[PDB]
Design a protein around this ligand. Structure first.
Ligand SMILES: C=C(/N=C/c1c(COP(=O)(O)O)cnc(C)c1O)C(=O)O
Ligand SMILES: C=C(/N=C/c1c(COP(=O)(O)O)cnc(C)c1O)C(=O)O
Ligand SMILES: [O-][n+]1cccc2ccccc21
Ligand SMILES: [O-][n+]1cccc2ccccc21
Ligand SMILES: [K+]
Ligand SMILES: [K+]
Lengths: 385, 386
């Protein structure tokens, strides 16, 4: 479970038996043809894989480049989160668990998890920070129709970090019955590997699709990063290929303002939610609140596999601001008729920061932006436009 | 030629006949144009997401003792079958040299699909929508605004889809040189019903190729909701005369005997609406009546003339389900399969309860997703009393 110095299992001791049970169950399905048949059949007919690789003509004309969008927004529930949620809730069901718990920020992991729990007939309890229940209300409504209990979390910054704190408390309190589903590549081993291994289908498809468009590997692949799961999924098959892989963190009000979620760029090594990784912290080791206009990127840590990729130079990381992401959200809506998630809008915003004339660029469009419409339409910066 | 038996035709103000003659000529010209179909089919694949999957609904199948498959048009870009037709007609508009698109919308799915295609092709877009629908389908108003379309609320008449189309047609007639009118269903003067059905019949062509990989035969039933008729025409057309039982499900509203419904085939009379001779809800003086449905996309007093022809000749069977039955089916699919369906499609799902399907193979056309309907459903008195 270590990516260089990062990762590990940094947990209360009472979780060690559950993590050993999960590691053995996961090793068992690695070679289980019937798990993969059921899972891959649901990815195809239930989620809608493979997703297309779309040539964005008007974006391409605007930037003088060949811009392709990997269309994870076309999946059932509207985001890449469903790849991981189906896989883990299937595993939970096969392990004899009867209940599912998770935390969610954008609400897309909450909806994906509730969808899979409904499909597999499991009780589902989702924790979501109170501020996120307000700015991502559409997903609260979806989870209620799917039969999940949504528990608003009123402590701390009332956003994703606090939601995960409460989901982990719930898991420990309910270990006989309950499987904890992380929605990103952050957590004690084996969870970063499990999540990345369910998301790497994105990069595997991309790798088969892009030579059909251009005859070679892309010059760049760009994906947003907070926990890191959509970017790990599209990057993993391309590590050491020579493609320029660029992960884009939330710069919030700006990297020098103290209001952002840029763990790799501005964090310090530390422990969060089971992983040794980069965490926004003060000088005394206290985890700090993150900020982002995007609820899914509003998290103060990052997956340990990205900490490792950054240190070894296998992936390059940077950030864009709330305002740059809002601009990119509006730009894709107007130019391509696709309303992107505000998370993915951080990757789209980065097209303005790379010299891409003549280049082939794949952007991971990790989800759709219907959950963000009310927040964008009311945002002061958009109001001043 | 425009007539489906005695139905259809071009029943319009004379001022529209030149535009319709030019549209029919342009459409015949693209039928053989490989470069049109290449561009269109590449967009359907990578932009809209076709083919859509044919999904085996294991828990619904267990519940009804049948093999139930859902044709997943809800997985398309924008969330409904409307995009198949919107991409194709806006591409035609571009090729005709038009610079502006207009349409009406009820559920707002056609409005969003048309706005999306207009954005992709760099065209001005003005969408008319009844004021009541701007309230019960508010998510789609927000989407249209982000896509750069102008949304005009229509405050006249019943403030729903019929009145929105009235105003889009007025706009077209005022703007005939610049503007292409995009109907969102198979209702309209010729050539529109044929154009729309020919962009939607991919749904049934895919289904016909997919179902033998699941079952080794054709299904016993295909079920789809019907108001104007486009999603049902798309999935039924390749199966006409095949021996499959095709069942179109109209909006029964508060009940076929209440006068508050949208069941044009079952309770309308022959008449003219929006260019078609077809079945139209009317009093006995020939005056069109307001329709009603809990579903904004089915809330329309007419039906496509191809469906009037299929009903008369027995090639498709038609029935209806009530608002409450549709709401029940909306909650049922959400809870049992984890799929939140559009309230329109929920009428087709509700029909699974109305026929004996034990031991039968059934395809339901899942024409759209239900995120536009969540607020309305959660606040509906019948659901609150649950
Ligand atoms: C944290 C959440 N969403 C994250 C998210 C992200 C960022 O999460 P990863 O860094 O794990 O990809 C990207 N794209 C979309 C559409 C997302 O919903 C959530 O749904 O709970
Ligand atoms: C009238 C509208 N919608 C109709 C609709 C319908 C009924 O229209 P057709 O009878 O033309 O399929 C079915 N399913 C979905 C998801 C729909 O949105 C509209 O979006 O303007
Ligand atoms: O679910 N979950 C669990 C732990 C860490 C996370 C970081 C980002 C998003 C989701 C997460
Ligand atoms: O757009 N449009 C135009 C004319 C009639 C219609 C019936 C149902 C749905 C849409 C329609
Ligand atoms: K972060
Ligand atoms: K009707």
């Amino acid at each position: 479970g270590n990516f260089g110095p990062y990762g590990g299992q940094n947990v209360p001791e009472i979780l060690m038996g559950a993590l050993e049970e999960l590691e053995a169950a996961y090793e068992g399905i690695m070679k289980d043809e019937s798990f993969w048949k059921e899972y891959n059949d649901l990815l195809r007919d239930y989620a809608g894989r493979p997703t297309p690789l779309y040539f964005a003509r008007r974006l391409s004309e605007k930037y003088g480049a060949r811009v392709y969008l990997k269309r994870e927004d076309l999946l059932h529930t509207g985001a890449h989160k469903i790849n991981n949620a189906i896989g883990q809730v299937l595993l939970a069901k096969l392990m004899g668990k009867t209940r599912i718990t998770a935390g969610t920020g954008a609400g897309q992991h909450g909806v994906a998890t509730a969808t899979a729990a409904a499909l597999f007939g499991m009780e589902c309890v989702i924790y979501m920070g109170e501020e996120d229940t307000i700015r991502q209300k559409l997903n609260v409504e979806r989870m209620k129709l799917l039969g999940a209990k949504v528990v608003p979390v009123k402590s701390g910054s009332r956003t994703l970090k606090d939601a995960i704190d409460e989901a982990l408390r719930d898991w420990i309190t309910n270990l006989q019955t309950t499987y904890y589903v992380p929605g990103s590549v952050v957590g004690p081993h084996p969870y970063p590997i499990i999540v990345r291994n369910f998301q790497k289908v994105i990069g595997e498809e991309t790798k088969k699709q892009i030579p059909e468009k251009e005859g070679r590997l892309p010059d760049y692949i760009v994906a947003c990063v907070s926990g890191g799961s959509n970017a790990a999924g599209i990057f993993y098959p391309f590590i050491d290929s020579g493609v320029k892989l660029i992960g884009v963190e939330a710069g919030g009000e700006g990297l020098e303002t103290g209001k952002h979620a840029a763990s790799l760029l501005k964090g310090k090594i530390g422990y969060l939610h089971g992983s040794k990784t980069f965490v926004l912290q003060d000088d005394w080791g206290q985890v700090q609140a993150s900020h982002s206009v995007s609820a899914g990127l509003d998290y103060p840590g990052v997956g340990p596999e990205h900490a490792y990729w950054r240190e070894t130079g296998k992936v390059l990381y940077d950030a864009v601001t709330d305002e740059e992401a809002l601009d990119a959200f509006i730009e894709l809506s107007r130019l391509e008729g696709i309303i992107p998630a505000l998370e993915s809008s951080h990757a789209l915003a980065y097209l303005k920061k790379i010299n891409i004339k003549g280049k082939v660029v794949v952007v991971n469009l990790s989800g759709r932006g219907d959950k963000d419409l009310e927040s964008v339409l009311n945002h002061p910066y958009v109001r001043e436009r």
